[PDB]
């Protein structure tokens, strides 16, 4: 068989013009061909007839659909392709992934992007290590917010941590007079720790409203998903410095690495196939036929795709097609209004380069330092330093979260 990669429209040109001849997939059971095909136009029917020719001729089951930049619906198109192929199509960027969500029941499509639940848990951990027990939930009408709210609430009440929610905000943003009522409740949000769920187009105007009211000042903290970030390359200069956001490993985990990992995963699934049942799946004869005999194969294929123990890293994917082991990047805005990495979410662990929360708030003229820097020195019974309980992220209420500041002796 073979693996086919498509470069639709605005696909990364250089990441193929130099990364086409960097493929190594040996020391496994299968020997598939890398088929690079580039269509510099967003024509649907062109890629549809290309995949039809693929099915009719090239007996290809693994397809790395490596294009980008818009319209999750196109993956929906892929899903229909999946609905007529049962093949594992993979999302690598844009309309294929980091926009895809809430897949269908009969969906044979797959993605390495995290689920709304997963990044919601990531930001909840973010505020957990920063002992932010108070938080206000604000979200627009954009579908995919009801389940996000349910997930975060279920995590809250199923948590021994003393989490406190101020108010859940449901926003009908595209309503003309709704904005007139909106300032009634948006102004009524006093908590500095607010979590947001909307889109980038929604994000711009909601941030404008917040700035006109004053929700972007000192103390206030903004938690937002990767959707509002859109394409982080085009940095929105209006958005405030100190805004902290989640995204995928964009600048580190490069596109050639993505496609090579996808091909390796598909080859691993094929190896499990040929090791457990030992037959190569047969392509459908024509693009206008229906068959169900692949049933005890199709999901079974997904079975050997749901358990991908390759590269040593057990990155086996979740039942919805996402990965149970996601890596996420947490970025804040720089002084020149750029996004830089601060937080890493890898193998269920959250780390941050600047552990101390830097006062990257709107740079107000020097004030009375209401948040003073204090040095201590351990001395019983006046000062006692002991280990934080890893369960609650703190100790007894008589304790204070004191960060012992090692000065690296040789590093």
């Amino acid at each position, epitope marked *: 068989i*073979g693996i086919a990669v498509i470069l639709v429209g605005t696909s990364d040109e250089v990441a193929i013009k130099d990364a086409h*001849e*960097k*493929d*190594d*997939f*040996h*020391h*496994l059971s299968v*020997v*598939p*061909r*890398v088929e690079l095909v580039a269509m510099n136009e967003t024509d649907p029917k062109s890629i549809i007839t290309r995949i039809c020719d693929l099915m009719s001729d090239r*007996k290809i089951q693994g397809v790395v659909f490596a294009d980008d930049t818009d319209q999750e619906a196109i993956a929906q198109i892929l899903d229909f392709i999946s609905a007529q192929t049962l093949t594992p199509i993979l999302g690598i960027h844009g309309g294929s992934s980091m926009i895809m969500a809430d897949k269908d029941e009969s969906s044979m499509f797959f993605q390495f992007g995290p689920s709304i639940e997963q990044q919601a848990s990531v930001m909840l951990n973010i505020m957990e290590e920063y002992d932010w027990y108070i938080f206000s939930i604000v979200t627009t009408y954009f579908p995919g917010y009801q389940d996000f709210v349910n997930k975060i609430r279920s995590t809250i009440e199923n948590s021994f941590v003393g989490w406190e929610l101020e108010e859940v905000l449901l926003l009908d943003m595209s309503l003309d007079d709704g904005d007139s009522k909106i300032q009634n409740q948006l102004k009524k949000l006093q908590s500095p720790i607010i979590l947001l769920y909307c889109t980038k187009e929604e994000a711009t105007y909601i941030f404008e409203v917040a700035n006109s009211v004053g929700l972007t000042g000192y103390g206030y903290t903004w938690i937002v998903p990767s959707l509002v970030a859109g394409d982080t390359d085009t940095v929105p200069s209006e958005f405030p410095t100190g805004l902290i956001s989640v995204s995928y490993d964009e600048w580190d985990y490069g596109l050639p690495a993505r496609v090579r990992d996808g091909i390796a995963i598909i080859t691993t699934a094929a190896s499990d196939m040929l090791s457990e049942h030992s037959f190569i799946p047969e392509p459908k004869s024509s693009c206008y036929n229906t068959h169900e005999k692949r049933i005890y194969q199709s999901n079974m294929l997904n079975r050997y795709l749901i358990n991908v123990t390759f590269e040593g890293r057990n990155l086996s994917f979740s039942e919805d097609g996402y990965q149970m082991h996601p890596k996420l990047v947490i970025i804040l805005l720089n002084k020149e209004r750029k996004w830089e990495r601060v937080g890493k979410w890898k193998d269920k662990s959250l780390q941050m380069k600047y552990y101390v929360w830097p006062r990257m708030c709107p740079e107000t003229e020097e004030q009375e330092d209401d948040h003073l820097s204090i040095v201590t020195l351990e001395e019983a019974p006046f000062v006692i330093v002991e280990s934080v309980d890893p369960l609650s992220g703190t100790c007894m209420r008589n304790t204070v979260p004191c960060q012992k500041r090692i000065i690296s002796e040789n590093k």
Partner: antibody
Amino acid sequence: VKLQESGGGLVQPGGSLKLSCAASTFSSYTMSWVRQTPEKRLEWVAYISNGGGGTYYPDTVKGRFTISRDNAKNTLYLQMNSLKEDTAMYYCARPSRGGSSYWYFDVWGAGTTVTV
Amino acid sequence: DIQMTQSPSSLSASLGGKVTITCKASQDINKYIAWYQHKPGKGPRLLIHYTSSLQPGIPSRFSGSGSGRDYSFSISNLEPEDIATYYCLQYDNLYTFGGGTKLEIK
């Protein structure tokens, strides 16, 4: 990129001489070289990938060959043993488009002989 | 691994005649076909791709047709600078080869 063979000879009948083929990217490119019969048949000898794995032979020369490669020097290493009945002419071939699979090349060697 | 047998044994034709050699494999190949010619002591030259796709620099003197596991490759209007021997290549497995044939002019 061009291929030049070296290390041809069968001075000991049934012995082991390690033939090789230097290249001038070939880093992601596999290998498969050819013997010629007095009938001039382009018979295969050994099989390697770009990553060195998949060590196999055709049914003609199985059970007597030690195989390896070094992409740093762009060279192969195989000691021929069961070519003692031939005036063999072997040449190295670099399969095109590289990869772990095997495709239709036009980048072959130059040609050096092995005679008993 | 799979093995082939090419056949038969000859390319007997005059100046500008017509010959054909068959790729015959022990297993289904799905039109995996290549073709090579080389002088004794010179080196191979590529002829044919999946759909008998000739390569630039090699004229349309060579054609062919076939499917599944059996293919035929025909040579005509041959000029006595290609005194060579033609061979077929399949890669269902890693690689596979058959017997092949040599060209003589009468």
